[PDB]
Amino acid sequence: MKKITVIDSHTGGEPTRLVIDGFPDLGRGSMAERLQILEREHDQWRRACVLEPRGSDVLVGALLCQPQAGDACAGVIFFNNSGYLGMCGHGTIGLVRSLYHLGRIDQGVHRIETPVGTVEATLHEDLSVSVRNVPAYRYRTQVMLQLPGHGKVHGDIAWGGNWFFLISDHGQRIALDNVEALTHYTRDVRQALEAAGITGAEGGVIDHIELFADDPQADSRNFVLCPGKAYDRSPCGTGTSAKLACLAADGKLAPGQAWRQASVIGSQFSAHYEKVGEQLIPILRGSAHISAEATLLLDDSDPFVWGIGS
Amino acid sequence: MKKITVIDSHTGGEPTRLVIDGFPDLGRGSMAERLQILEREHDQWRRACVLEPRGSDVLVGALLCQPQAGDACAGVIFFNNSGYLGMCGHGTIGLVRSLYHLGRIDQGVHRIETPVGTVEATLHEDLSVSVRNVPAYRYRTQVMLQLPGHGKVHGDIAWGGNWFFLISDHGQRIALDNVEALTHYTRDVRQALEAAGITGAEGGVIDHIELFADDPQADSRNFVLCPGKAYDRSPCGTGTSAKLACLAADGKLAPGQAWRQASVIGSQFSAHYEKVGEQLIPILRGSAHISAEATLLLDDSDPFVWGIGS
Numbered sequence: 001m002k003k004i005t006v007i008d009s010h011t012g013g014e015p016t017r018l019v020i021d022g023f024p025d026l027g028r029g030s031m032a033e034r035l036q037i038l039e040r041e042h043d044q045w046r047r048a049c050v051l052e053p054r055g056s057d058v059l060v061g062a063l064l065c066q067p068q069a070g071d072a073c074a075g076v077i078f079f080n081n082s083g084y085l086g087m088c089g090h091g092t093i094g095l096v097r098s099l100y101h102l103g104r105i106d107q108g109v110h111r112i113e114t115p116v117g118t119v120e121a122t123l124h125e126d127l128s129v130s131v132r133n134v135p136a137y138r139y140r141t142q143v144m145l146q147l148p149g150h151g152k153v154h155g156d157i158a159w160g161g162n163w164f165f166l167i168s169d170h171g172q173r174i175a176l177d178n179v180e181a182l183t184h185y186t187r188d189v190r191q192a193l194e195a196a197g198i199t200g201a202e203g204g205v206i207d208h209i210e211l212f213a214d215d216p217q218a219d220s221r222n223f224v225l226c227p228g229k230a231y232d233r234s235p236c237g238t239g240t241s242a243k244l245a246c247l248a249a250d251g252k253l254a255p256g257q258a259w260r261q262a263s264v265i266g267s268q269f270s271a272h273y274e275k276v277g278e279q280l281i282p283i284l285r286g287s288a289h290i291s292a293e294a295t296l297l298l299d300d301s302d303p304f305v306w307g308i309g310s
Numbered sequence: 311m312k313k314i315t316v317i318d319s320h321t322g323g324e325p326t327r328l329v330i331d332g333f334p335d336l337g338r339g340s341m342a343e344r345l346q347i348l349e350r351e352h353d354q355w356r357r358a359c360v361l362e363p364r365g366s367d368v369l370v371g372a373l374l375c376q377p378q379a380g381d382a383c384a385g386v387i388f389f390n391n392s393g394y395l396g397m398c399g400h401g402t403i404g405l406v407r408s409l410y411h412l413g414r415i416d417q418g419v420h421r422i423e424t425p426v427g428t429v430e431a432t433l434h435e436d437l438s439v440s441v442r443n444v445p446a447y448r449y450r451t452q453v454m455l456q457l458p459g460h461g462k463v464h465g466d467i468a469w470g471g472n473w474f475f476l477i478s479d480h481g482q483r484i485a486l487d488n489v490e491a492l493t494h495y496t497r498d499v500r501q502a503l504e505a506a507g508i509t510g511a512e513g514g515v516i517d518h519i520e521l522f523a524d525d526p527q528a529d530s531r532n533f534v535l536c537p538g539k540a541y542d543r544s545p546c547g548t549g550t551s552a553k554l555a556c557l558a559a560d561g562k563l564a565p566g567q568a569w570r571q572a573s574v575i576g577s578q579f580s581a582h583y584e585k586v587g588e589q590l591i592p593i594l595r596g597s598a599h600i601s602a603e604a605t606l607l608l609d610d611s612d613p614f615v616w617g618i619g620s
């Protein structure tokens with residue numbers, strides 16, 4: 001009956017469902033203001049779009065919006081199985097590659113509005129996309145955490161467009177064949193954070209957990225638990241952004257130096273940061289590929305028209 | 311680049327991806343013969359169609375085929391994240407509802423060829439579908455199984471279009487909020503069957519495990535572990551077929567008597583059986599709803615064009 005028109009893509013294995021038509025009107029405010037309206041009045045639509053049966057727990061959605069600023073090519077709101085994101089590095093790369101597929105933009109530099117500020121994406125001749133993210137920073141370093149299964153760990157708390165807890169001394173094996181244990185470990189970590197009342201700046205909920213390890217073919221490999229407990233198949237743009245701020249603050253990466261980040265499934269991003277005054281600006285480069293052109297159909301007779309689950 | 315045209319639907323929450331164009335030609339043999347060719351020569355296409363990133367571990371695929379018999383409206387081969395199915399009740403309901411969506415059939419009686427025999431589907435005025443399945447039977451009864459860490463259990467081995475092990479005395483709580491434990495439990499059951507060399511007839515691999523429990527609004531509620539370790543969101547057509555055979559053999563359900571089966575997520579099928587000779591014929595009725603019209607796009611520059619995973 002009701003139709004939602006989408007372009008599905010993935011960035012290093014992590015899917016983006018770009019909604020290009022069919023969602024409710026959210027007005028003409030900022031992306032942040034539109035997010036509030038989307039969540040308050042139309043959250044069932046998020047659930048229809050990305051939850052089973054028409055989506056999956058893994059899926060991240062991106063609502064295409066007309067931006068406020070005249071020099072912006074687009075605005076976007078990102079969401080997942082549990083709620084709403086801030087920025088989304090993999091999804092921005094997906095958005096830009098999808099706009100190109102639609103013939104709406106060409107190669108070159110594009111400004112994209114998001115609920116956490118405007119980012120600048122460059123669509124290259126090889127169709128990869130560089131994202132100049134919002135500023136990233138470390139809020140707290142080596143925060144101690146007691147994990148009943150494993151004992152103490154230390155993690156950094158940092159902002160890369162979403163809030164992250166970053167751990168290196170976890171002692172877990174990071175590989176696709178181990179995502180079940182990795183998922184349980186990171187869930188135990190988030191539980192420990194909540195118990196100890198640990199947050200980011202201004203009580204920011206730390207809803208992403210990332211583990212880092214050495215890799216024979218990159219600078220690092222990671223595992224990232226997302227807010228709704230799915231893992232990120234990509235190297236995580238905002239998560240890697242947070243990582244750059246931590247490396248920089250520890251004296252381990254200077255402006256302009258390349259950092260290659262592999263994901264739990266082996267996909268890679270390249271990144272570096274620039275300094276503009278006091279601010280650290282992460283720049284991520286990766287590729288998205290188109291997965292499908294789809295029209296979701298919302299049957300009013302379907303008991304699960306607005307999604308399965310709690 | 312390459313395109314696969316599909317109709318996505320779901321039956322009681324269990325998704326079916328009906329491929330209506332784009333797969334390789336499999337010749338003009340029986341559905342069983344075409345299955346052999348699909349698997350040996352083109353298994354990468356199953357993977358692109360149903361695995362991440364373009365699919366999901368939950369997804370069951372159905373390749374629409376031209377049938378051999380002039381009185382048949384269609385042939386089908388069903389597949390999932392691990393390999394190939396025999397019959398598929400939820401998928402047959404999805405197929406028939408999808409054919410109606412495409413305007414290719416109207417209400418009435420339709421014969422569908424599958425790798426395990428021809429089934430008869432009736433599309434009703436309310437758009438629900440009754441499936442007269444292939445004959446079902448119980449092979450062995452109350453087979454004792456030792457479960458390390460759980461206890462010992464007893465199960466029936468029965469054929470309902472696929473091979474099932476059916477357990478009542480498992481002591482597990484069947485509900486959507488417990489699928490993690492239920493998945494681990496049923497995985498342990500399959501491991502135990504393999505350890506003991508327990509099979510169906512002619513060494514048939516028992517690749518579906520189902521647990522049954524009482525339900526305040528149905529005759530029973532089940533949890534079904536499918537061959538690739540995902541659970542069936544639906545009451546499971548072939549699994550419920552096998553259940554009818556066991557109930558009949560135990561003197562607990564007579565021909566023509568209704569049996570209401572609820573799934574782990576609360577969706578329901580009604581079923582009964584008829585007798586033709588020694589043969590027990592399961593008849594399942596349920597509804598599918600269309601989820602999406604999609605064109606999957608297979609980019610040759612995509613490293614995961616043929617799917618992620620082992």
Ligand SMILES: O=C(O)[C@@H]1C[C@@H](O)CN1
Binds near residue numbers: 087226232239
């Ligand atoms: O690439 C990113 O930034 C996002 C964050 C995750 O929630 C999903 N991937």
Ligand SMILES: O=C(O)[C@@H]1C[C@@H](O)CN1
Binds near residue numbers: 324370536547548
């Ligand atoms: O309904 C059925 O018969 C099938 C069996 C499972 O593999 C998936 N659903």
Ligand code: NA
Binds near residue numbers: 214217218219220
């Ligand atoms: Na390395």
Ligand code: NA
Binds near residue numbers: 526528530
């Ligand atoms: Na009951």
